Design a protein around this ligand. Sequence first.
Ligand SMILES: CC(=O)SCCNC(=O)CCNC(=O)[C@H](O)C(C)(C)COP(=O)(O)OP(=O)(O)OC[C@H]1O[C@@H](n2cnc3c(N)ncnc32)[C@H](O)[C@@H]1OP(=O)(O)O
Ligand SMILES: O=C([O-])CC(=O)C(=O)O
Ligand SMILES: O=C([O-])CC(=O)C(=O)O
Lengths: 92, 1021
Amino acid sequence: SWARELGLIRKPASFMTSICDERGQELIYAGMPITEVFKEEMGIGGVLGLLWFQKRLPKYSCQFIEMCLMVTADHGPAVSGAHNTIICARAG
Amino acid sequence: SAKAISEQTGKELLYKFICTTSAIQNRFKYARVTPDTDWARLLQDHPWLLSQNLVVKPDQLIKRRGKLGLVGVNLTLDGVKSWLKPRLGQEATVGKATGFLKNFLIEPFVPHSQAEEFYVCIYATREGDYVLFHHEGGVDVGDVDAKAQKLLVGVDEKLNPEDIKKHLLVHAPEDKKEILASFISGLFNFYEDLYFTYLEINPLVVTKDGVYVLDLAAKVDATADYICKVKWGDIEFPPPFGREAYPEEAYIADLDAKSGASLKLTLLNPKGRIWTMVAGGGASVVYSDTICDLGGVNELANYGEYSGAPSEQQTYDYAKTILSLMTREKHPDGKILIIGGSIANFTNVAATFKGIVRAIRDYQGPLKEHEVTIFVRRGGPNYQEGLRVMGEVGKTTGIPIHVFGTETHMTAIVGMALGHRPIPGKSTTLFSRHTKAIVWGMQTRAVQGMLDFDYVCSRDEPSVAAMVYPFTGDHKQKFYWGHKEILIPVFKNMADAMRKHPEVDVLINFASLRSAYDSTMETMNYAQIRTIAIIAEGIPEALTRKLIKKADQKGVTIIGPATVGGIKPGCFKIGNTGGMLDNILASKLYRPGSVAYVSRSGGMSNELNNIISRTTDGVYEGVAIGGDRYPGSTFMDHVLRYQDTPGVKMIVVLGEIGGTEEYKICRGIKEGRLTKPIVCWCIGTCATQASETAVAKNQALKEAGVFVPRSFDELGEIIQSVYEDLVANGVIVPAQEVPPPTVPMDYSWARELGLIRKPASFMTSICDERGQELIYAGMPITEVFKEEMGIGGVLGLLWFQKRLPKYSCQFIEMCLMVTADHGPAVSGAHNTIICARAGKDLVSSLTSGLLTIGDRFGGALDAAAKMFSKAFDSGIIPMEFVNKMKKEGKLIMGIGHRVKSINNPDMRVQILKDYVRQHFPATPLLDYALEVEKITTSKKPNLILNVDGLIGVAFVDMLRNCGSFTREEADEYIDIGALNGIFVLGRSMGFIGHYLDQKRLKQGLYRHPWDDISYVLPEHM
Ligand SMILES: CC(=O)SCCNC(=O)CCNC(=O)[C@H](O)C(C)(C)COP(=O)(O)OP(=O)(O)OC[C@H]1O[C@@H](n2cnc3c(N)ncnc32)[C@H](O)[C@@H]1OP(=O)(O)O
Ligand SMILES: O=C([O-])CC(=O)C(=O)O
Ligand SMILES: O=C([O-])CC(=O)C(=O)O
């Protein structure tokens, strides 16, 4: 930690992460800080465009992402995955 | 690498793979007699042997036996028996060489005349294949090259027989002109389908009866075996005829064969005082040349090398053999051991010196007894700590060891060892600062070294535009540019590499010795690639000549095979030339100089960079052409290239023994084409065509106007003398030294020599994966399998890190056999089936069913162990325990079966109960659980012990009451969850069985019908 602080050593980094700069003064998302996220009033479609695609999508596309996350919510407990969730929840 | 084969082997290969109209007689008619075999077996399997008249001659790679009269012709049984009696197995001499005669060949002798003997030969040259035919065969040659007809055939060119009869058959008898020529044509295909370099048949007897190949000789390309191992079968190369090898020499031979290192040792005078063990090939040749200059032609004990960074056991045994060989008998002028060497490219010098210091301290007694003095001189990455450890073992064990770094001359230390001095078309520019390369192959340390060099030489763009690796997709690899990280694209094909990067003009071919030719031929189908550097070693020479031919046709500058590359300082660096960046900064290779050089071996190029750094201004551009026989660009192709560039003022050439290449430099300096001051020196004297030697080329360049030193010791001195000549004439001005940019060093290299501590996480007291054996808990994998412990023993090793006693390993196998599948109706196997019928995966199905192992399903093992252990540890009677559980809700976990309980048992509680009764010392918690079973079966005819409760209490009974668990480890593993581990690892077999079953019955997706659901939703939310 000291030989790298005064910068006399090389260490190759893994985990290249082109998303979510967590350290510093703000949670920078794709390139947009968190206060700019809540200032432009982009919903979860805007942060899906920022996290998943790293692009500020236009406001008709964020609302379509929220629409297609509202229709692909629950579709009854008969289906195979919701059945497994219920079976695993009833085992407590 | 031409290696001469036995004439028995080449003669049987000629008998097997020739295809011609002329019938070869005596097909498969030969015998090999030797001292290791008898005589009756040869007559037993070859019944043709004593039917005719025979000729017997020694097959031990001996030239000129027909002129010297050492052949026994016209021999019957008495001739072939009493001829070998003064000959088979006795010591004899030919030329200089003295040794045994243990190999003799027996051929059916054919009487014939001297007007029927012919002479045919095919030898390889750089510009093609020469076939050479004299009508007068045998030993009566007369004139040799004048009346014998020659024909140069080109590479990748077909031999036309009309040019055979037109040009080569001038002095032939005409009736054999269809017998010989097509045969020769067939022989030419035999030369071209088996990759010979030299094949001379003399004499070839073309009688009226047919053709007879009595005597031949063949040097074959030993590196082409990957093409022709189906043709040669198991080829055998005989050693050149000489004395017998010591056991030490065969010991070093199997040390050489057993790894990727080069451990060469051949003793010269075993009672000698000056013993050499020196890293590098050219460095060994130069040290042997200099010690032969200083009167040690009888005092050099051996010539050898240790190269390719051997392991410290290999280094230890190699130095052990050389140290034991030099303590046999004392020599009164003192015995010297020279651990010399060139500058190491990337090897940590201190690790090889750990090998040396173990091999010296292990054999120190004979060293201080025989009064041995050790002279050590090395260079490279971290040489200074290695000189320090050699110095401390010099002062510690008392052996006088004189250590030296790169500040000294390389081979002047032997002058300090002997007391002679006291001890202290093709383009003319190849690389520019916009030269971009494409590397072929994942050779990331070479690309990182090139990027470090180009940061240090203040270059603005990295000279590796892309890499090419065919065995992976297109991605980008992260490299270091100074401090920063950049992304260099790695491609799959070369076509989209040349497409996306049109500024490339160099390709550096890091492919192997069998894929260099195809990638190089594919590369020259792109016009922008103007030079190709081929780092591979071991290409067959015919494929190299095809590469040279297509290079001259396309106009590219091939650096030649078996190179290390060639460094143009301040500008560009090919691969691993120069070495690690410590040698680049130590030799001032970050700014251009004025001296160019051309060498052959890569081991001498670092020494030449060191010499030109320490004596003169520095290297403008250096090129190592390759240690192969046909380099892609010779000496003249580079000194002509240094002629036209004005930045260079003087040229240094390091030539080698063999190959009339420096005579072309002599003719170029006599024709007035080479005007810049040349300093040539040719290595390889070895005087312990007669013009191809080192002293011949040295004298011929000395008389031609080229500065040639007396030895290698005066090479730096006269290079400094020519530099002082050239600056005093007022043309060489030394440029002003700007300091280079600095790179940070490495985390891998600073921790290797230990200069930066790092806190390690992930403490892992289990499974040392690295080393020779996969060491489980403290016990290797061979001790696991040899001691015959099942999977219960490896669960004791992985989970508990103890070697459990043999009755409890079988108990863990037992309780993993009963906690396997228990039907598919239960909740977890139901989830596995539901996920397997969705066609998912094995691991996703097992995992989706495994995530149910919780508290209600599968959580009776751990709870039924914890409950009974807390009741027993407290110390209450069972009748109070049942009443305590009744008073608080909380049904006793591990007690209760739905169907089978009393005189209708569970039948797998019974097997486990019989096992914990029989093979199992001192089991009190099971007895307590059986008393609680007595009470709760007195309550209800159900309520027998479960299998969950009995595995729980039997496992807690196994932990604390067998050995090796104290009381706080056996109580730790219950609270950690080592019983949930047994239920999950046991039930994993059942869940994978359910996955494979539902995947094998081809079952469709589940739906769980609506009539089993009863939706109870609110009215309007
Ligand atoms: C032909 C004809 O018509 S019949 C003639 C006349 N008919 C009659 O008289 C009717 C008789 N009625 C019966 O026989 C009924 O079976 C009954 C009412 C007595 C039920 O008796 P049971 O089944 O034994 O009681 P129950 O199911 O609650 O369990 C009994 C015990 O097991 C205990 N127990 C159950 N599970 C566990 C467990 N895992 N761990 C520890 N204890 C347990 C219970 O706590 C209970 O304990 P307790 O006796 O201290 O209260
Ligand atoms: O790059 C090279 O060929 C040199 C090398 O690795 C070594 O010295 O072991
Ligand atoms: O251990 C468990 O609770 C699961 C079990 O035996 C069962 O199939 O009923």
